[PDB]
Amino acid sequence: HWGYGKHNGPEHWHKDFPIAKGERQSPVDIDTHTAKYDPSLKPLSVSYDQATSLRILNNGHAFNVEFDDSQDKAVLKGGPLDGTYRLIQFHFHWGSLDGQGSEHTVDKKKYAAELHLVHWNTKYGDFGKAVQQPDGLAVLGIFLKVGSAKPGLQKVVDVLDSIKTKGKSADFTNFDPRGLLPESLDYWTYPGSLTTPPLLECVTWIVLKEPISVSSEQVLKFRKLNFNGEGEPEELMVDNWRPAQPLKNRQIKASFK
Numbered sequence: 001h002w003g004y005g006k007h008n009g010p011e012h013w014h015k016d017f018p019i020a021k022g023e024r025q026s027p028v029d030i031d032t033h034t035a036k037y038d039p040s041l042k043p044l045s046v047s048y049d050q051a052t053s054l055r056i057l058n059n060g061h062a063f064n065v066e067f068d069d070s071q072d073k074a075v076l077k078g079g080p081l082d083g084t085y086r087l088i089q090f091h092f093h094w095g096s097l098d099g100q101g102s103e104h105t106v107d108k109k110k111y112a113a114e115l116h117l118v119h120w121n122t123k124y125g126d127f128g129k130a131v132q133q134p135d136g137l138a139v140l141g142i143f144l145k146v147g148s149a150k151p152g153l154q155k156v157v158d159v160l161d162s163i164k165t166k167g168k169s170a171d172f173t174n175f176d177p178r179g180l181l182p183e184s185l186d187y188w189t190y191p192g193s194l195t196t197p198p199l200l201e202c203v204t205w206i207v208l209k210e211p212i213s214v215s216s217e218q219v220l221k222f223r224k225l226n227f228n229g230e231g232e233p234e235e236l237m238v239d240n241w242r243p244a245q246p247l248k249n250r251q252i253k254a255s256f257k
């Protein structure tokens with residue numbers, strides 16, 4: 001099945017998921033010179049004070065930190081969005097080296113990693129229904145650069161030993177995702193897709209301009225994870241990013257001057 005090897009990586013996904021060659025695929029390169037400032041965009045409203053993290057899972061593709069999405073406890077609103085979007089999970093994509101790992105790029109620059117906070121539109125009732133709608137999801141994307149440690153990331157890093165292989169989970173309560181945000185909420189936005197199969201074209205992307213800094217040590221621990229299951233040949237979970245896709249007939253809008 002699909003993955004990030006030579007034989008099963010991004011360049012193969014279209015055979016099982018033909019929407020991979022669609023009109024609104026993600027990620028994309030953000031050309032900062034052609035993204036136009038849209039004064040009609042609102043500030044983003046990130047309301048995570050009541051967020052309830054539950055569990056962390058190695059799904060064989062990344063690790064997901066999962067939230068209780070049975071009520072409006074951690075929600076994204078404003079920005080480009082109409083209505084209310086509930087946080088369901090976050091996860092990262094990262095590289096084998098610090099010079100690649102992000103999905104989105106900025107003027108062709110690749111960051112060491114990218115965080116995706118996934119939210120679904122409450123008007124559709126559940127996640128599964130939301131992903132069938134063009135405005136079903138809002139994903140907040142945050143770039144990671146290697147420098148100073150991110151204190152708020154360390155709780156995630158330190159549990160990764162317990163979910164080394166595919167299918168492992170661990171309790172992961174009381175984690176505050178506010179500690180993963182940069183100072184500024186300036187953003188770019190465009191319509192796109194999930195970046196993993198099934199690649200559904202259901203996402204309003206909100207990509208923050210300001211990266212967070214993580215330490216080398218932190219990212220090294222991501223790279224100790226495994227794609228494989230327990231007692232299978234070890235294959236390090238690295239380079240779990242889809243490259244930039246054609247922009248096609250889209251515009252990327254900037255919230256800032």
Ligand SMILES: Cc1cccc([N+](=O)[O-])c1
Pocket residue numbers: 116118139193194195196197198
């Ligand atoms: C399959 C799946 C589920 C949730 C989120 C994404 N995504 O952001 O690409 C993909």
Ligand SMILES: [Zn+2]
Pocket residue numbers: 091092093116195
């Ligand atoms: Zn992602």
